[PDB]
Design a protein around this nucleic acid. Structure first.
Ligand SMILES: Nc1ncnc2c1ncn2[C@@H]1O[C@H](COP(=O)(O)OP(=O)(O)O)[C@@H](O)[C@H]1O
Ligand SMILES: [Mg+2]
Lengths: 87, 580, 107, 98, 93, 95, 86, 107, 93
DNA sequence: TCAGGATGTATATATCTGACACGTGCCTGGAGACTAGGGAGTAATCCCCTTGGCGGTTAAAACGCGGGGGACAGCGCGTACGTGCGTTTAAGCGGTGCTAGAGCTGTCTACGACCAATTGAGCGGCCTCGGCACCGGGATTCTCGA
DNA sequence: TCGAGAATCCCGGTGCCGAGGCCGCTCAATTGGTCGTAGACAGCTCTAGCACCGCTTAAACGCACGTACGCGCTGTCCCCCGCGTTTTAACCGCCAAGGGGATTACTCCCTAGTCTCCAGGCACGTGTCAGATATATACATCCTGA
C-alpha cells in the first residue's frame, strides 16, 4: 500500500521551480525554457557530488565523522573555487 | 535545616512584591479569611474544593505573593481561575489588568467559559492572520482591555504588543510546556519586564529529570531565583539505597515538602468527585521472533557489538522488523502483504491473539503508537485482518480531529481499535467510550500514564479500564521500562505531596506517607505463550469466562506452520552480513 | 635595552614578528631572510589599505557608515586589475553587481 | 477590466530586485536534505556542521549564478533571448568541465 | 582555545584610511581570509621560486620577484615602491 | 575541379593526421624577439626556449580555434566570425 | 654583431600558415577578419607568457632566457608543458 | 651485512631511496615517514606502467616498434579518466586526435 | 655537470610491460617530466594536507589521502591497491 | 547508372641515424650504531549534532488559464571568400667565425639559527551604545492604454 | 502625439544587537651571546648564441572567376509569461536521550641526526640496427555526367 517510502517526491526535486527561477534571474537572464530545470538539477547534483567527495575525503582522512566549514573551504580552495568569509 | 535560612531570605526579600507593587507566619502575617464566592458569578455554583482552593489562592493574594495550582486534570482549573478573576475583580477592586496564556487547542474552551461565568469581563482573542488580528491590535493599543487571551506563539510574535503595555496580574496555563529553562519563550518572559504577580498552572507536576528547578523552583518566585541557584544539587542529591534515600535524607524530603507549603496546591480527583469506578494497571511479557531473535543481537554485533543504534534500534526493529523497508525486499521481495508477514514480529503475536477475542467479546480498544512506520504497517495489516477502525496523527490538521470524534462516539459504529500517537491531541481529545488501552513502546516520561491513562479514567467511563504494556525478554528497552517506570517513580514523593498538599490530615505526612514508603521499600522486590492466563487477563466476570472458554473450545478442534516466522535459514543470516 | 617592536621601526601596521615566525614554521624554506617579513608586511599594508579603501568609497556611496560584504564585492569588481587578481576566486555574501545586456532590454 | 503588465517588464523588475539584494536565495532545508542524501552515497552517517552546509550552499549558489550568466551570454550570442539546454551545456562544455 | 586572526591590524588600517567608516564581523573575517590567502600565494610561490635557483634561503629579493610575478598589472609597482621603502626604512633604523 | 568544402575535409584530415609543427620558425623567432625587446633589452633566447614557446602558443591557439568552431556551429553559422572567437576567450574567463 | 631590419614584424604570421593552424583545430569555413583578431589574442598571450619568463630570467641575474624559465612561466600560467624539462 | 636496496624489497622499479631523499630535501614536511616513499614508488609504478602500456597499444596499432609523443597523445586522450587527470595540462609534439563534427561533414 | 633523470627506471617499466617496444629520447624526456610533475602534485598536495591537520610529519596515510584526493576516477583504486600492497610487502620484509 | 580524372595504400632497396648493448669512473643509497622528540593512548568537562516524533504560522509553491511574442522554418539576394594560377621570394640549410655569459671551482665573511632572560602586545571576557533594520504614509515615476 | 496606477524611494519614529572600547591575563615578541655555514665575490673554461654569406626551393601572394552561404525579410504557431486562486511545507519552537569534538598529562616508540664503509647509476666513449626520404604501383575515392 502507501506504507512504502518508495512513493514520495524525490529529494532532487527539492529545488523548486521559482527557486531556480529567481536564481537565474540574479544571473541576468530574461526568458527561460522548460528543460533548464531538469538539466540544471543534473548539473547541480554533479557539482555537489564532486565537492562533497573531496569534503568526505578530507574529513575521512582526519578520522572525524564531523564535516566542518574548514573542510569544504579546503575542497573548494583546492578545486580553484576558493571561498572567503569562513576559513 | 535550611528552611530557617530561607525564612531569613524571605525576611529580606519579602518586601519586593508589596513594596515595589512557624513558617506559615510569613504568609500568615496578614489576618483575613473570606470563604464567600463572588456574587456576580453566573452560570452555576462552585464546588466545595473549588471554594477551598479559591480561598487558598485569594489567601495568597492577601499576602499578595505568587501561587501555584498543581492539582490533577479534571478539577476545573478554568472556573477556579476565572472565578479568581471575577472575585478579585469584584471584592478587592483592583479589577485588572489581567493576562491569560493558554494553548490554542484550549483557547475555545477558555474563551467559551469566560463568557458564561464572567459576562461583565471584557476579553480579547488573537487568531485569523494579521488581518483580523490587527483590528483587536488597534483595540488593545488604546489601553482598552481587562482579560486578554493569547497563546505561546503570540508571546514572541506579539512581543511588541506585550512590550508596549505594562500588566498587573498574569495567570498562564500549560506550565509543563513553559517549564523549559533555556526555552526562547522563557527568556523573552525574562526580558518581558513584568506584571505585579504571576500564577503558573500545570496539569502535572515536575516529571522526568531531577526535582523542580527550572520551572517552579526558579522561574515562578522572586526570592527563589537568587536563593535556589546553588542549592539545586544540594537538594537534588537524594533522587546507597537505605543509607541515603531513607536514613538521613527522609527529613530532607520533609523539608522539600515543608518549603512548598504556601507555594503548591494539589488535590487528587479521587478525594473529591471520585467518579472513576476503578482501574486495572497490569503489564504483559512478550518474547522475540525471527529477526528479533539472536539475529537482532547479531545486528548489534556486526553493526556495533548509521549511529545512535541503542535508542534507534529499539523503537524500530523490536516493535516490527523491516521498518527500514530495505530488508523488506530481502525477506519479502514480492512487496505484497500475505499471511504471516505481520507475525514475524514477536510483539504482534500477542496482538493477533487478542484481536479475535476483542472482536468476539465486542470491546473497543485504544492503541497508542510511536514511530509512525508502525502506524503504516499496522494499518495495512489492520486492513488485512478486515476489521473497522479509525486513524489519527500529527498531520491530521484537526479537521478529522474535530469531525472524527462524532464518528467514533456513535454507539452503533463498528469501529473497535482507535489509532493514536503518544504526543497527539494535547490532552483535548476527550474520549470516554473505550475501556481498553494497549501500548507498544513505553514513553520516556510519565506522560504516557498521565495522558494515555487519563484518556480512559476521565469522567464518562463507568466500566473497568484494562491496560496491556508490551515488553520483550532480554532487551535493553526493558531497562528503559524499569528506568522510566521505577527510576521515574521519584515523583512518588510529589504524588504523595498532593494528598498533604490538600487539606493535609496530620497522619498523612507521617503515618500514611510511611504506608507509601512501603511502596518505597518494595522497589527491588519488584525487580525480580499461555492461552489461559492471557485469556483471563481480559476477563471481567464469569459470563465472559463462558464465551472465552467457548472460544477455547472453538479453536480446540481445529489446529488453530509454527508459532511465528522463524530464522528457510538463507533469509535470516544473509540479511545484514552483506551490508556492514 | 628598551624593547621596541620592529614592526614599528618600519612604520607599518601588520606585524613583522608574526609573519616572520609563521613564515618560518610554515616550512616554506629551510632558512629565512631578514627584510622578507618586513616586505610582506608592507605589501599586505598596501593591499589591505587599497581594497579596504575602495570598500570605504562604496560604503560612502551607499550612505552606510559600516561596511558590508556587498561593499567589498563592489570594491573588488569595480577595479579592473584588482578583479583580475580575484577573478578566479569566488566570495561569500557579496552577490553580483547589476548588469543588463544591451539588446536584451526593450526600447 | 483588470490591469496587467506587458511581458518582459516583470523580468526587469525581478532581476533588479535580486541583483540589488545580497540575501541567500535557494531555501536552506531542501538543500540540507539534498546534501545529506547525496553524501549518504559515499560514506554512511556523516555529520555536517551548520557552517559547512551554509558554506557548500553559498558556494554552489554563486557558481550556479555564474553558470546562468554565462548561459545568458551564449544565448544572446545565438540571437535567441531564450536559454535552452544546448547553450547551458555549451557553457560548461566550453569551460573545460564536460 | 586560541584562534589567531589579523583583525585589529585590518582595524588600524581602516582607521588610518577611513576613520569614521566601520567594519562588520563578516567583513573582518572575509578580509582576514583575504590576507591569509594572498600571503599564502606570495610566500608559497617565493618558496618554489627560491627552490628553482637551488638557493636554500628565502630573502627580500625572493619576495620581490614573488610579488612582482604574482599579481599582474600596474598594482605591482606601488607594492614594490612601498615594500622597498619599508625595507630601507627598516635597515636605516 | 572539386566542389567547395571537400578540400577543407582533405586538409583537416591531413593536418590532424600529422604531428609536424605548423607555423614557420623564423617569423615566430622575429616575433618573440621583437615583443621581448619591449620589456627588457638585448635578451638571449635558447633554441629550445623558442621551440617551447612556439609549440605552446601553437597548441593553445589550436584549442582556441576548436572552441570557436563549437561556438560557431552552435550559432548555426558554419563560418567563424570575430564575435564567437572573442566569445571563446570571453567565456573562458580571460577577457 | 649587426642588426638586420626586415619589415612586417607583427602580422608576419602568414594567412596560409595561420589558416592551416585553424585547419588543425577542425574549423570548416574561415572568415577574413579571423586573422587580425587571432594576431591580437596571440599577441596578448605572448605578452603574458614572455613577461613571466623574463621575470624569471631577470630574477636569476642572467642575460639568457632558458627553456626552463618558459616551462615555469607556463607552469604558473595554468598549462604545464612536457618534454623540455621540469 | 650484505647491502640490499629496499626498492627491491618491495619488488618495485622506481627507487625508494631517491624519492625518499628528494622528498626530504624538498621541504614538504619537517619529518618524513617510513613507508611513504615506498607508497609513492608504487603509485608511480602503476601510473607509468598504465600510461606507457596504453602507449604500447597505440604504437602496436600504428605498426611502430618504438613510441612517438603522438602515441603518448593517443594513449592519454583515448582513456577517459586518464584524460581527466591530464585534461588541464597540455603536451608537446603530441597534436590533436582526429575528430570531425557530425553535421559539419557533407552527405 | 650532473643532471639527474628517472630514465632507466621508465626503461625497465617499458621492458616489463612491452619487451619488444622501444622508446625514443623525446618520449623519455616527456615521460620524465611527466613523473616529475605528478610527483610534484602528490607530494606538494600532501604537504599542505598534513599542514591543515597541524601534523608535523608526512606519512603513508598523508600520501594515501593525497593520491586518493588528487586524481579522480576509478584510476585511484588501483593506485591504492598497488600502494598498500607495496607498503605491506615492504614492512613484511 | 559509368571514365577519367586530383589524392592516399604496399611493396623491395638503400640509407643516414640515433636507440640500445657494452665498458669505465665516481657520487650517492644503505646497513649498523647511537641520541632525542612527535604523536597515539587513556580520561574527565562542556558544547554541538542526530533521529524519531509533536504544535502552530504564514509566505512561497503548484495548478490553471488567457494570450503575447519569439523560435523557427522557408525564400531571395548580394557579397565573400574558396579554388586555381603564374609570379615572386623569403624561409631552410649548410657553413663558417666571434665572443658573452652560463657554469664550475675556490675562499671568507655577514648572517640566520639556536639558546637564555625579559616583558609589552594581543586576545579573551564585560559592558555599553549608536547604526542598521523594520513600520505606516506619502510624494514622485515609469508603464499601461486611449 | 498624451493621462491614471502599481512601484519605488523619502521620510521620520521605535528597537535591538553586533561593534567597539575597557580591564585583565599570559606568552609569543624582543634583546643579547655564541656559532656553524650558505652565498658573494673572483677568477677561469668553453660553448652555445649571434653575426652574416651564399645556395636552393617549397611557400606565400596578388589576382581571375564562381557558387556557398549569411543575413534580411516573412508568415506560423507553440511555448513561456503574468496573473489569480488553492495548498502546503519551510520555519520556528519543543521533546526524548544519546554520542561526537576538545585540553591537559604521563608514557612510550619511530624517525630527525650521525659517523662509518660499500655499491647503483650516469657522463663519457665504441659499434651496431628501425625508419623517412626516394622510387613506382592497383586500389580507395569523388566530379562530370547521364
Ligand atoms: N463548579 C463547577 N460547576 C459546573 N461545572 C464545572 C465546575 N467546575 C468545573 N466544571 C466543569 O469542568 C469543565 C472544565 O474542566 P477543566 O478546567 O478543563 O479541567 P482542568 O482544570 O483539569 O483542565 C467544564 O466543562 C465544566 O463543565
Ligand atoms: Mg481548568
Amino acid at each position: 500500500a502507501k506504507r512504502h517510502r518508495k512513493v514520495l517526491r524525490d529529494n532532487i526535486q527539492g529545488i523548486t521551480k521559482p527557486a531556480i527561477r529567481r536564481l537565474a534571474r540574479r544571473g541576468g537572464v530574461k526568458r527561460i525554457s522548460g528543460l533548464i530545470y531538469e538539466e540544471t538539477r543534473g548539473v547541480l547534483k554533479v557539482f555537489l557530488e564532486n565537492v562533497i567527495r573531496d569534503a568526505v575525503t578530507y574529513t575521512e582522512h582526519a578520522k572525524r565523522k564531523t564535516v566542518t566549514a574548514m573542510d569544504v573551504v579546503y575542497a573548494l580552495k583546492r578545486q580553484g573555487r576558493t571561498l572567503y568569509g569562513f576559513g | 535545616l535550611l528552611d530557617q535560612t530561607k525564612d531569613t531570605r524571605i525576611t529580606h526579600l519579602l518586601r519586593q512584591t508589596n513594596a515595589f507593587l512557624d513558617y506559615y507566619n510569613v504568609a500568615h502575617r496578614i489576618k483575613e479569611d473570606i470563604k464567600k464566592q463572588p456574587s456576580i458569578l453566573v452560570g452555576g455554583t462552585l464546588k466545595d474544593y473549588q471554594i477551598k482552593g479559591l480561598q487558598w489562592m485569594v489567601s495568597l493574594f492577601n499576602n499578595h505573593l505568587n501561587g501555584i495550582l498543581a492539582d490533577e486534570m479534571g478539577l476545573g482549573k478554568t472556573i477556579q481561575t476565572i472565578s479568581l478573576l471575577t472575585y478579585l475583580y469584584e471584592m478587592k477592586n483592583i479589577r485588572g489588568p489581567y493576562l491569560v496564556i493558554v494553548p490554542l487547542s484550549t483557547l475555545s474552551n477558555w474563551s467559551s467559559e469566560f463568557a458564561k461565568w464572567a459576562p461583565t469581563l471584557r476579553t480579547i482573542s488573537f487568531k485569523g492572520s494579521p488581518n483580523e488580528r490587527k483590528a483587536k491590535q488597534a483595540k488593545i493599543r488604546a489601553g482598552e482591555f481587562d482579560v486578554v487571551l493569547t497563546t505561546f506563539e503570540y508571546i514572541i510574535k506579539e512581543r511588541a504588543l506585550l512590550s508596549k503595555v505594562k500588566w498587573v496580574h498574569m495567570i498562564i496555563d500549560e506550565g509543563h510546556r513553559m517549564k523549559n529553562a533555556q526555552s526562547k519563550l522563557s527568556l523573552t518572559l525574562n526580558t518581558h519586564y513584568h506584571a505585579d504577580y504571576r500564577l503558573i498552572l500545570t496539569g502535572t507536576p515536575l516529571q522526568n529529570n531531577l526535582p523542580e528547578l527550572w520551572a517552579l523552583l526558579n522561574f515562578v518566585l522572586p526570592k527563589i531565583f537568587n536563593s535556589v541557584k546553588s542549592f539545586d544539587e544540594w537538594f537534588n542529591t537524594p533522587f546507597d539505597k537505605i543509607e541515603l534515600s531513607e536514613e538521613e535524607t527522609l527529613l530532607v524530603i520533609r523539608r522539600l515538602h515543608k518549603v512548598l507549603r504556601p507555594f503548591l496546591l494539589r488535590r487528587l480527583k479521587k478525594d473529591v468527585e471520585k467518579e472513576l469506578p476503578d482501574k486495572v494497571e497490569k503489564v504483559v511479557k512478550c518474547k522475540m521472533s525471527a529477526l528479533q531473535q539472536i539475529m537482532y543481537q547479531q545486528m548489534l554485533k556486526y553493526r556495533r557489538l548509521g549511529f545512535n543504534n541503542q535508542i534507534m534500534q529499539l523503537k524500530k526493529i523490536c516493535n516490527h522488523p523491516f521498518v527500514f523497508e530495505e530488508v523488506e525486499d530481502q525477506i519479502n521481495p514480492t512487496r505484497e502483504t500475505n499471511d504471516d508477514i505481520w507475525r514475524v514480529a514477536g510483539k504482534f503475536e500477542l496482538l493477533d491473539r487478542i484481536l479475535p477475542k476483542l472482536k468476539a467479546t465486542g470491546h473497543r480498544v485504544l492503541i497508542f503508537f510511536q514511530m509512525t512506520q508502525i502506524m503504516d504497517i499496522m494499518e495495512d495489516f489492520l486492513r488485512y485482518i478486515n476489521i473497522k477502525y479509525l486513524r489519527l496523527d500529527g498531520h491530521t490538521k484537526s479537521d478529522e480531529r474535530s469531525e472524527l470524534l462524532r464518528l467514533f462516539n456513535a454507539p452503533d459504529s463498528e469501529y473497535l481499535c482507535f489509532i493514536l500517537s503518544t504526543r497527539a491531541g494535547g490532552l483535548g481529545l476527550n474520549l470516554q467510550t473505550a475501556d481498553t488501552v494497549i501500548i507498544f513502546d513505553t514513553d520516556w516520561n510519565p506522560h504516557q500514564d498521565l495522558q494515555a491513562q487519563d484518556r480512559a479514567h476521565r469522567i464518562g467511563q463507568k466500566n473497568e479500564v484494562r491496560i496491556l504494556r508490551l515488553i520483550t525478554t532480554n532487551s535493553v528497552e526493558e531497562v528503559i521500562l524499569e528506568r522510566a517506570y521505577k527510576k521515574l517513580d521519584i515523583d512518588g514523593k510529589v504524588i504523595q505531596a498532593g494528598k498533604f498538599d490538600n487539606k493535609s490530615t496530620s497522619e498523612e505526612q507521617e503515618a500514611l506517607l510511611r504506608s507509601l514508603l512501603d511502596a518505597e521499600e518494595e522497589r527491588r522486590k519488584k525487580r525480580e505463550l499461555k492461552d489461559s492466563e492471557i485469556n483471563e487477563i481480559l476477563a471481567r466476570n464469569d459470563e465472559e469466562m463462558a464465551v472465552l472458554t467457548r472460544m477455547d473450545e472453538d479453536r480446540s478442534k481445529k489446529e488453530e506452520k509454527s508459532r511465528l516466522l522463524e530464522k528457510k535459514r538463507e533469509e535470516s543470516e544473509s540479511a545484514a552480513v552483506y551490508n556492514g | 635595552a628598551k624593547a621596541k617592536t620592529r614592526s614599528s621601526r618600519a612604520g607599518l601596521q601588520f606585524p613583522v614578528g608574526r609573519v616572520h615566525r609563521l613564515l618560518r614554521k610554515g616550512n616554506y624554506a629551510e632558512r629565512v631572510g631578514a627584510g622578507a617579513p618586513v616586505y610582506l608586511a608592507a605589501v599586505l599594508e598596501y593591499l589591505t589599505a587599497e581594497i579596504l579603501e575602495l570598500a570605504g568609497n562604496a560604503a560612502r556611496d551607499n550612505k552606510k557608515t559600516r561596511i558590508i560584504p556587498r561593499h567589498l564585492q563592489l570594491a573588488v569588481r569595480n577595479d579592473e586589475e584588482l578583479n583580475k587578481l580575484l577573478g578566479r576566486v569566488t566570495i561569500a555574501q557579496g552577490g553580483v553587481l547589476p548588469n543588463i545586456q544591451s539588446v536584451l532590454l526593450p526600447k | 477590466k483588470p490591469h496587467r503588465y506587458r511581458p518582459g517588464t516583470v523580468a526587469l523588475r525581478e532581476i533588479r530586485r535580486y541583483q540589488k539584494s545580497t540575501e541567500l536565495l535557494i531555501r536552506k532545508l531542501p538543500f540540507q536534505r539534498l546534501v545529506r542524501e547525496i553524501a549518504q552515497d559515499f560514506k554512511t552517517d556523516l555529520r555536517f556542521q551548520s557552517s559547512a552546509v551554509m558554506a557548500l550552499q553559498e558556494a554552489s549558489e554563486a557558481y550556479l549564478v555564474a553558470l546562468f550568466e554565462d548561459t545568458n551570454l551564449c544565448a544572446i550570442h545565438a540571437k535567441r533571448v531564450t536559454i535552452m539546454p544546448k547553450d547551458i551545456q555549451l557553457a560548461r562544455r566550453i569551460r573545460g568541465e564536460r | 582555545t586560541r584562534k589567531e586572526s589579523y583583525a585589529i591590524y585590518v582595524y588600524k588600517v581602516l582607521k588610518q584610511v577611513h576613520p569614521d567608516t566601520g567594519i562588520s564581523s563578516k567583513a573582518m573575517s572575509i578580509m582576514n581570509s583575504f590576507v591569509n590567502d594572498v600571503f599564502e600565494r606570495i610566500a608559497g610561490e617565493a618558496s618554489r621560486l627560491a627552490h628553482y635557483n637551488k638557493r636554500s634561503t628565502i630573502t627580500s629579493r625572493e619576495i620581490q620577484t614573488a610579488v612582482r610575478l604574482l599579481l599582474p598589472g600596474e598594482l605591482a609597482k606601488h607594492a614594490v615602491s612601498e615594500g622597498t621603502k619599508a625595507v630601507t626604512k627598516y635597515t636605516s633604523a
